């Protein structure tokens, strides 16, 4: 992961900021507000972007795959927007508290990783189970990298991480798109796509007045 001063930029013909160097994957020189000027801020922001990207990828899958299969009839899942207010085997509060406990353990160990890199790579109960990762944000090991694709040449690793970051950015945009589309149109996302494909000249945002 070496400097790349001739990489494509978000704004062709401009000069990338000095802190955006090109060693990080998926770097296009985009930081107009100077939010990552400090090295510590950049270190924190990289991890924040990674976790946001992965969570939004899972969210995009969970919204768009089940709702496409409902329109085909392979599944009969309810709408994603109102799926939170349905009745389950337990009330929503205890589900949220159990999720808080479990995800809090996981997130606290991730926080310990961020603050101190080695720190938490070893099993608390069985000393022999270790995470084989090396860089922060990529824990590795049998649990988070069973197939071994997470380690390799310093050149294929950069592109493998760039694909992840760009897919996560796209999913991050898509989740908010689905949310606002449901707020402003009153129907599902696949309905919106089909309606827009039927009448692209009219079935848009401006078809609300």
């Amino acid at each position: 992961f070496a400097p790349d001063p001739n990489r494509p930029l978000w704004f062709p013909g401009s000069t990338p900021p000095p802190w955006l160097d090109g060693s990080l994957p998926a770097d296009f020189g985009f930081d107009p507000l100077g939010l990552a000027s400090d090295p510590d801020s950049l270190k924190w922001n990289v991890q924040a972007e990674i976790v946001h990207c992965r969570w939004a990828m899972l969210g995009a899958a969970g919204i768009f795959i089940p709702e496409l299969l409902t329109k085909i009839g392979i599944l009969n899942t309810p709408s994603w927007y109102s799926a939170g207010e349905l009745q389950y085997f337990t009330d929503t509060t205890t589900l949220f508290i159990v999720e808080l406990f479990f995800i809090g353990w996981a997130e606290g160990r991730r926080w310990a990783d961020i603050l101190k890199p080695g720190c938490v790579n070893t099993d608390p109960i069985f000393p022999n189970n270790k995470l084989t990762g090396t860089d922060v944000g990529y824990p590795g090991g049998l649990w988070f990298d069973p197939l071994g694709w997470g380690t390799g040449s310093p050149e294929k690793l950069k592109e493998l991480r760039t694909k992840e970051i760009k897919n996560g950015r796209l999913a991050m945009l898509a989740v908010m798109g689905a949310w606002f589309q449901h707020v402003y149109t009153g129907t599902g996302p696949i309905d919106n796509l089909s309606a827009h494909l039927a009448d692209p000249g009219h079935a848009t945002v401006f078809a609300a007045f």
Binding site: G34, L35, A36, S37, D38, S41
Partner: protein, 40 residues
């Protein structure tokens, strides 16, 4: 970034943030527990 965090740690800005949070807390407590003369 560092300089802006230093500025946000200056006395008046921290004071207005702290007192705004305090005022919001007290206002919400009074909205949900109004007209308290004693402590049951």
């Amino acid at each position: 970034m560092r300089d802006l965090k230093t500025y946000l740690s200056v006395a008046p800005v921290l004071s207005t943030l702290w007192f705004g949070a305090l005022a919001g807390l007290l206002i919400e407590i009074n909205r949900f527990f109004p007209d308290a003369l004693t402590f049951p």
